[PDB]
Each structure stands twice: as C-alpha cells, then as structure tokens.
Enzyme design. Structure first.
Site, PDB file in Angstrom:
ATOM      1  N   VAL A  16       2.852  -5.952   3.369  1.00 26.48           N
ATOM      2  CA  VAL A  16       2.426  -7.031   4.165  1.00 26.48           C
ATOM      3  C   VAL A  16       2.890  -8.359   3.623  1.00 26.48           C
ATOM      4  CG1 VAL A  16       0.364  -8.180   5.034  1.00 26.48           C
ATOM      5  CG2 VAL A  16       0.317  -5.725   4.705  1.00 26.48           C
ATOM      6  N   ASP A  59     -12.209   5.060   6.351  1.00 23.16           N
ATOM      7  CA  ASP A  59     -11.594   4.562   5.135  1.00 23.16           C
ATOM      8  C   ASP A  59     -12.212   3.233   4.716  1.00 23.16           C
ATOM      9  OD1 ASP A  59      -9.805   4.734   2.934  1.00 23.16           O
ATOM     10  OD2 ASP A  59      -8.327   3.501   3.993  1.00 23.16           O
ATOM     11  N   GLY A  78       0.855  -1.167   0.000  1.00 21.23           N
ATOM     12  CA  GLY A  78       0.000   0.000   0.000  1.00 21.23           C
ATOM     13  C   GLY A  78       0.889   1.213   0.000  1.00 21.23           C
ATOM     14  N   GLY A  79       0.294   2.358   0.291  1.00 21.44           N
ATOM     15  CA  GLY A  79       1.034   3.596   0.416  1.00 21.44           C
ATOM     16  C   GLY A  79       1.949   3.600   1.619  1.00 21.44           C
TER      17      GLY A  79
HETATM   18  C1  LIG Z   1      -2.242 -13.155  -2.191  1.00 16.45           C
HETATM   19  N1  LIG Z   1      -3.171 -12.259  -2.939  1.00 16.45           N
HETATM   20  C2  LIG Z   1      -4.140 -11.475  -2.375  1.00 16.45           C
HETATM   21  O1  LIG Z   1      -4.814 -10.735  -3.091  1.00 16.45           O
HETATM   22  C3  LIG Z   1      -4.315 -11.446  -0.969  1.00 16.45           C
HETATM   23  C4  LIG Z   1      -4.344 -10.229  -0.283  1.00 16.45           C
HETATM   24  C5  LIG Z   1      -4.526 -10.172   1.111  1.00 16.45           C
HETATM   25  C6  LIG Z   1      -4.671 -11.362   1.863  1.00 16.45           C
HETATM   26  N2  LIG Z   1      -4.825 -11.487   3.218  1.00 16.45           N
HETATM   27  C7  LIG Z   1      -4.515 -10.522   4.095  1.00 16.45           C
HETATM   28  N3  LIG Z   1      -4.750 -10.783   5.394  1.00 16.45           N
HETATM   29  C8  LIG Z   1      -4.495  -9.815   6.364  1.00 16.45           C
HETATM   30  C9  LIG Z   1      -3.981  -8.566   6.045  1.00 16.45           C
HETATM   31  C10 LIG Z   1      -3.751  -7.582   7.093  1.00 16.45           C
HETATM   32  F1  LIG Z   1      -4.106  -8.069   8.310  1.00 16.45           F
HETATM   33  F2  LIG Z   1      -2.526  -7.181   7.133  1.00 16.45           F
HETATM   34  F3  LIG Z   1      -4.494  -6.430   6.851  1.00 16.45           F
HETATM   35  C11 LIG Z   1      -3.756  -8.347   4.667  1.00 16.45           C
HETATM   36  N4  LIG Z   1      -3.267  -7.159   4.274  1.00 16.45           N
HETATM   37  C12 LIG Z   1      -2.837  -6.825   2.904  1.00 16.45           C
HETATM   38  C13 LIG Z   1      -3.680  -5.830   2.366  1.00 16.45           C
HETATM   39  N5  LIG Z   1      -4.860  -6.273   1.919  1.00 16.45           N
HETATM   40  C14 LIG Z   1      -5.807  -5.403   1.342  1.00 16.45           C
HETATM   41  C15 LIG Z   1      -5.519  -4.058   1.237  1.00 16.45           C
HETATM   42  N6  LIG Z   1      -4.279  -3.599   1.734  1.00 16.45           N
HETATM   43  C16 LIG Z   1      -3.380  -4.457   2.271  1.00 16.45           C
HETATM   44  N7  LIG Z   1      -2.202  -3.998   2.753  1.00 16.45           N
HETATM   45  C17 LIG Z   1      -1.476  -3.087   1.849  1.00 16.45           C
HETATM   46  S1  LIG Z   1      -2.481  -3.305   4.314  1.00 16.45           S
HETATM   47  C18 LIG Z   1      -3.594  -1.914   4.244  1.00 16.45           C
HETATM   48  O2  LIG Z   1      -1.211  -2.785   4.956  1.00 16.45           O
HETATM   49  O3  LIG Z   1      -3.076  -4.412   5.178  1.00 16.45           O
HETATM   50  N8  LIG Z   1      -4.028  -9.316   3.770  1.00 16.45           N
HETATM   51  C19 LIG Z   1      -4.656 -12.568   1.154  1.00 16.45           C
HETATM   52  C20 LIG Z   1      -4.493 -12.611  -0.223  1.00 16.45           C
END
Ligand SMILES: CNC(=O)c1ccc(Nc2ncc(C(F)(F)F)c(NCc3nccnc3N(C)S(C)(=O)=O)n2)cc1
Ligand SMILES: [Cl-]
Ligand code: NA
Ligand code: NA
Length: 316
Positions: free
Chosen positions: A24, A131, A19-20
């Site tokens: 993760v 958000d 993200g910005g």
């Molecule tokens: C493998 N391909 C996929 O598309 C995928 C994506 C996410 C997940 N699962 C997952 N679980 C938990 C988190 C937690 F807890 F960190 F938020 C998380 N975050 C990634 C995140 N997610 C959507 C928006 N921003 C994201 N990041 C930049 S952010 C704001 O920093 O959380 N993602 C599984 C698969």
C-alpha cells in the site's frame, strides 16, 4: 506500465505498508488534492489467492459506514489490481497500544465501541470479517477507528476462534476475535500466545488466560463471556451491544447503523463535477449512478469526503 493507468489520476508517495497479499502506497488524488491509500496487488504472484481480491472488492462495494475504510476506485491493468482506499493517517491501533503500553478501561471502551459498531454493521449486511485484529483497525484524521482488509470476509491464529480453527459460525467467531482485541487493548499483550503454533492452538482450545491485576470485575466478566471456547455459550453480538460494561459512561447501546449511507446523489458534488468537466448535469448524474468504481466514482466520493469534514466541494 501498469502504473501508467494509475499515474493518470494519482501522484504516488511512499509505501506505507506491506502484507502477504498487497503493498500500500500513500498517494494524492490529482483532481481533489485528497490523500488516499492505494492497495497494489499483482495478479501473477497472487495466483490462487486472487479470490481474496474480488471478495474484498465486492464486500466494500456493499459496506458504507463511519467505522469502515471506504473504497473509491478499482483499476485493473494487465498485471495489477489497484484498490484506492481511504487513507488513515493515524496508522494502526496495534502500534497505538504498544506506544501506550495498554489503555485504561475508559479509553478502551471509547475505542472498543467503534470496533463493535463496525463489526455489528458488517454482520447486519450479511458478512463476517473473520480477520479482526488491531493491525486491521486504523486511526483516521479524527482519531476514529476504521476497519480494513475484507479479503477473508464471508457471506491471525492468535485472534482465531477455536471453532474456526477446528473447521466448524462466522458471527460467533468475530465475537471471539473482538474478545481477544478487548484483552489486548486493556492488557497490552495477547491472552493466548506461543512461539510454537500447535502449542498456541492448544492454549486457545483450553481457553485459560492470565487475568491481570488492573482489570475491573466487570471487564473480567465481559472477557469471560466473549472468550468462551464453546460458541453456544459465547455472548451473542446482540447482547454485546448493550452489555453493562459497554454501557458504563454512555448509557446507550453501541450505535452500529451506518450514519453515512448512500441515499440520493449529493447535488454539490454532481454540480461541481458538471461545472469542472463542462458536461450536461443529467448525463453527469447518469454516469455517476453507474457506480463503476472508476475515476468518476473516485472523484465523486472524494468530493463527498470533503463535505463530510465541512470543507467546500471544489475540484482542481
Ligand atoms: C506510515 N506508517 C504507518 O504505520 C502507517 C500505516 C498505515 C496507514 N494508513 C493506512 N490507511 C489506509 C490503508 C488501507 F486503506 F489501505 F487499508 C492502509 N493500509 C496499510 C496497512 N495497514 C495496516 C495493516 N495492513 C496494511 N496493508 C498491508 S493492507 C492489509 O493491504 O491495507 N494504511 C498510515 C500509517
Ligand atoms: Cl457508540
Ligand atoms: Na504477560
Ligand atoms: Na444504531
């Protein structure tokens, strides 16, 4: 270097999102075998946005709910902040909507009641999320929704309420954002969209949107009540909970109260920790009860998670 501290307790796998403000990675918590999501933030390159980190962290220490992504561990090193969170293997609601084109009103309701449950709880604890969008709602292993990203919570533009973009009402603003969400779930595109940000801003302020032919009269009415430009004329969170559209096929208001609150420490978790670490039980209880969000907190909570899904409470 900064990863040395983290690698004591987690095996790191692929980056699952950027993200910005954070990246993760998928990771495995060594002691429990549990997969987790580690949010990585560089203190140096964030600079003025470093308040977003503390905001999210303090919010998540005060939120414990079936539709909110759980915090396990906060680690700060010289240059990084690491937040270990619940891993949602289903990914983003947004990608789920695109794959289906749009959801039926029945399935939208199933999903939307979970969003309302999370957000109403957030509000009940004195916060606004601010958000809300389908990128910030993830599917867990049960295909249930989990809300993420509390960096802007108080105590994007396509989803922002007119009053909030005008700089004034956090409660009412979340309702507006949930209306945009509701629209995207049922339509598969935004009600207000434009390549030019000011033209998008104008569309939002005007409050006019396309009403597709597949929407039921009751759904159209609900959107109209949520997407009122004037927050005073907008449906309050209260009446959203038992709105007739929302009640269709359920006949009870949205269940928003936490179903998994922290009452007393769990004995099996405490016991297993004491036995695995060969420590005095009472000391173990006392140290867990500090709730430091260090590795002991992480281990305790990830043991509770095993229990939450009917698995035995066992540490490797
Ligand atoms: C493998 N391909 C996929 O598309 C995928 C994506 C996410 C997940 N699962 C997952 N679980 C938990 C988190 C937690 F807890 F960190 F938020 C998380 N975050 C990634 C995140 N997610 C959507 C928006 N921003 C994201 N990041 C930049 S952010 C704001 O920093 O959380 N993602 C599984 C698969
Ligand atoms: Cl419900
Ligand atoms: Na369109
Ligand atoms: Na309830």
């Amino acid at each position: 270097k900064d990863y040395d501290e983290l690698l004591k307790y987690y095996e790191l796998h692929e980056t699952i999102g950027t993200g910005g403000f954070a990246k993760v990675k998928l990771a495995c918590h060594i002691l429990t075998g549990e997969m987790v999501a580690i949010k990585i933030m560089d203190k140096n390159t964030l600079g003025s946005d470093l308040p977003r980190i503390k905001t999210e962290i303090e919010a998540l220490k005060n939120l414990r709910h079936q539709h909110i992504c759980q915090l396990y561990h906060v680690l700060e090193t010289a240059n990084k902040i690491f937040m270990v969170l619940e891993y949602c293997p289903g990914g983003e609601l947004f990608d789920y909507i695109i794959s289906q084109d749009r959801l039926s009103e029945e399935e939208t309701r199933v999903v939307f009641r979970q969003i309302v449950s999370a957000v109403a709880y957030v509000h009940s604890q004195g916060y606004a999320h601010r958000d809300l969008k389908p990128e910030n709602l993830l599917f867990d292993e049960y295909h249930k929704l989990k809300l993420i990203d509390f960096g802007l919570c108080a105590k994007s533009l396509a989803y922002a309420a007119p009053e909030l973009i005008q700089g004034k009402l956090g409660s009412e603003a979340d309702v507006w954002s949930m209306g945009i969400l509701l629209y995207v779930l049922m339509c598969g595109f935004l009600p207000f969209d434009d390549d030019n940000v000011m033209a998008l801003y104008k569309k939002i302020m005007r409050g006019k949107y396309d009403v597709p032919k597949w929407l039921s009269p009751s759904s159209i009415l609900l959107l109209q009540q949520m997407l009122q430009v004037d927050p005073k004329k907008r449906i309050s969170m209260k009446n959203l909970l038992n709105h007739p559209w929302i009640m269709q096929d359920y006949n009870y208001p949205v269940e928003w109260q936490s179903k998994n609150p922290f009452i007393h420490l769990d004995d099996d978790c405490v016991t297993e920790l004491s036995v695995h670490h060969r420590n005095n039980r009472q000391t173990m209880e006392d140290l867990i009860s500090l709730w430091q969000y260090d590795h002991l907190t992480a281990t305790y909570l990830l043991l509770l998670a095993k229990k939450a899904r009917g698995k035995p409470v066992r540490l490797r």
